[PDB]
Design an enzyme around this catalytic site. Structure first.
Site, PDB file in Angstrom:
ATOM      1  CD  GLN B  54      -3.038  -0.665   0.147  1.00  0.00           C
ATOM      2  OE1 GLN B  54      -2.967   0.019   0.357  1.00  0.00           O
ATOM      3  NE2 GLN B  54      -3.330  -2.178  -0.509  1.00  0.00           N
ATOM      4  CG  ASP B  55       0.279   4.096  -3.256  1.00  0.00           C
ATOM      5  OD1 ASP B  55       1.368   3.075  -3.694  1.00  0.00           O
ATOM      6  OD2 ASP B  55       0.067   4.703  -4.450  1.00  0.00           O
TER       7      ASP B  55
END
Ligand SMILES: Nc1nc2c(ncn2[C@@H]2O[C@H](COP(=O)(O)OP(=O)(O)O)[C@@H](O)[C@H]2O)c(=O)[nH]1
Ligand SMILES: O=S([O-])[O-]
Lengths: 187, 160
Positions: B54-55
């Site tokens: 996830q970013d």
């Protein structure tokens, strides 16, 4: 009657099957809230099985995860204290995306229970993920050369909406995890 | 040495790590946290982490793996719908300053599946011929059997 004990064993064997059985036999209402309450009470349930259920990607399971987090009270706890409570109620899966969803759900509840401690839920979620990384680094024997405090402080730079968290906060979290790993839950 | 392993969800990262666990003679007591496995040879060891995805947590692994020497990217060779997305994610990894000196091992996984893209097709669709300043290798694998895994790690040893 005997059906409830059977459903619990089925849950331990295969969580979705146990839930299917309990719902079909009218022993559990098929709502995220009722399933969550069942898992939070955890009567005769294996915490690995609970964790596995809460970690599934499916819509219902995600709604159960949020309802399960809603049953936890984290007021007046620091982040590590709250994580220890949360991670005692189920066995955390190892898959990173499962951990990620669990930490984001946790962080939303932590922040609601402790307003003003973190300036965004994102900051809390990222820090929580970082704390799981630290427990892994410090206590997983596969990891040879442990992270010192300075390195943990550096790992968290920028996560406070572009800035840094207080060093004293990071030190307090680091010291707690170093002194006591997250306990492998007993059921 | 620590090695980050990334790839889209369902690529086979967990399955790979579990196979690597079985190959080791050192058994490990359970820990709470991420899946991490050390593969120990006489003159080198790899500690492979599944910790991306996830970013918002990218800064944590950028920092933890700063100046790391190798990166493993896992792709589902059967997932033609998401191969372009895999390419885009790979290119984001290869643009990170922190991983600039990392060699790239690609595991082209799920080669057992009847409609799987072959190694040449994955090389094309992941844009590997475009890389200029990167040592890279594509290793065909089946993570459920373990085939290809040690062969890819052997290359990574032969680069490191
Ligand atoms: N047919 C086939 N399935 C695989 C292979 N590797 C993994 N899988 C399956 O793909 C799914 C996702 O694997 P997983 O390791 O959890 O992926 P991750 O999300 O990248 O960790 C699981 O159902 C695995 O059993 C493989 O080489 N061949
Ligand atoms: O999700 S598993 O690897 O505990």
């Amino acid at each position: 009657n005997r059906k409830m004990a059977m459903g619990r064993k089925k849950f331990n064997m295969d969580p979705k099957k146990g839930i299917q059985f309990l719902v079909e036999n009218e022993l559990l209402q098929n709502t995220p809230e009722e399933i969550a309450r069942f898992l939070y009470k955890g009567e005769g349930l294996n915490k690995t099985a609970i964790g596995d259920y809460l970690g599934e990607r499916e819509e219902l399971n995600l709604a159960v995860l949020h309802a399960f987090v809603d049953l936890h009270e984290f007021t007046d706890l620091n982040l590590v204290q709250a994580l220890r409570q949360f991670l005692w109620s189920f066995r955390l899966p190892g898959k990173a995306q499962k951990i990620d969803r669990m930490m984001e759900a946790f962080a939303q509840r932590y922040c609601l229970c402790n307003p003003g401690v973190f300036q965004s839920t994102d900051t809390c979620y990222v820090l929580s993920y970082s704390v799981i990384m630290l427990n892994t680094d410090l206590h997983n024997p596969n990891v040879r050369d442990k992270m010192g405090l300075e390195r943990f402080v550096a790992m968290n730079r920028g996560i406070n909406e572009g800035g840094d968290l207080p060093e004293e906060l990071l030190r307090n979290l680091y010291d707690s995890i170093r002194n006591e790993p997250f306990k492998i839950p007993e059921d | 040495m620590r090695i980050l392993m990334v790839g889209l969800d369902a690529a086979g990262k967990t399955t790979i790590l579990y196979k690597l666990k079985l190959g080791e003679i050192v058994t490990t007591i359970p820990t709470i946290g991420f899946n991490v496995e050390t593969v120990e040879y006489k003159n080198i060891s790899f500690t492979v982490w599944d910790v991306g995805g996830q970013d918002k947590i990218r800064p944590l692994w950028r920092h933890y793996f700063q100046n790391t020497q190798g990166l493993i990217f896992v792709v589902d060779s059967n997932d033609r719908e998401r191969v372009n997305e895999a390419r885009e994610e790979l290119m984001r990894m290869l643009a990170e300053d922190e991983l600039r000196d990392a060699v790239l091992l690609v595991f082209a996984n799920k080669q057992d599946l009847p409609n799987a893209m072959n190694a040449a097709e994955i090389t094309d669709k992941l844009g590997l011929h475009s890389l200029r300043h990167r040592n890279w290798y594509i290793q065909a694998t089946c993570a459920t059997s373990g085939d290809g895994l040690y062969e890819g790690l052997d290359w990574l040893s032969n680069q490191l």
